[PDB]
């Protein structure tokens, strides 16, 4: 199943999982983690395009440069920086638009580039992403992880300190980018299987209970 | 000293046992002084009635004082004593009654300013008495004065909601019923200052775990 979007029980029934779909769940939760990771596109597109021309960027691939540059369509327009700035200016409706089988012209408008950015996000192979990231993979991949449903309130249930422990155990999770994926999966698996206990606060409370009951019944 | 923004918790261990006890003690004392007394949770107390001659006798000094102060107006018929009460919060600004002794007065209303009556009650009260008047409502009040200390400042933000709650509960349970209460809390205080505060603290639950592991492996 594709639900890592399980609001909580992701961290609940994982404990609690036979090695099969635990190794599975960890693996493709990792795959999801990369696949979702934001690339901060503006530098990326500018550095891939330039110094080319409107018709000639639409020529290449690089699927994503194309997917993004299907937005030369709104109106006329290296010169992509121009596009960016000259667009994000207003949230209102100004820039003209094309007509295919019939006129839809004064429309977005402020596309928020969810149009173009999203298009790109759709058109980029994930590996290209891994390479293009190169150790910013840490903050980005972790940053998808943080907005997961399962991770929804962690910061305020467990506190700042527990949350930082988790970030740091995540960055320390993989070195170097070479094995990045294989690394992260590991971490996911090991946290999914038991836990997440501390970094959980309850996990810790329980850990201490059980841990002093086995320094208790040690009688022997 | 109290009011130490951070230090108190971190630097309380280790003060010499005499200094620790001085802190635990003067601390209980503060919690009890600063306790917000919140009258009108006292109205339904022995005003149920009527409830007429109370103000006459009113064994406990606070009712004697308070009432013998609030009896100088018409008492507000035609909606027990409750009717009259309402006329003085929303009475703003009615400017009504209080005939002396002689005539006039005209009046303080105000609705007027009960604050004279509550000044009466609170000046007519001791702190031990306060302990008495609270009655299992002591827990909450004394706690929400304890969170007003500088050391408690960001406690739920660093350690999270769950720990804040465990801390509360642990505090509330610090005392079985009223008899020994001032002592119990003191013991609890001393108890949590000597060591820690460890969990409830996040960091302390961690060290506590790793140390119970170091005792595990240190022996076995």
From TrEMBL, chain B:
GO molecular function, one term: actin binding
Protein name: WH2 domain-containing protein
Native source organism of the sequence: Vibrio parahaemolyticus serotype O3:K6 (strain RIMD 2210633)
Full-protein positions shown: 247 to 480 of 484
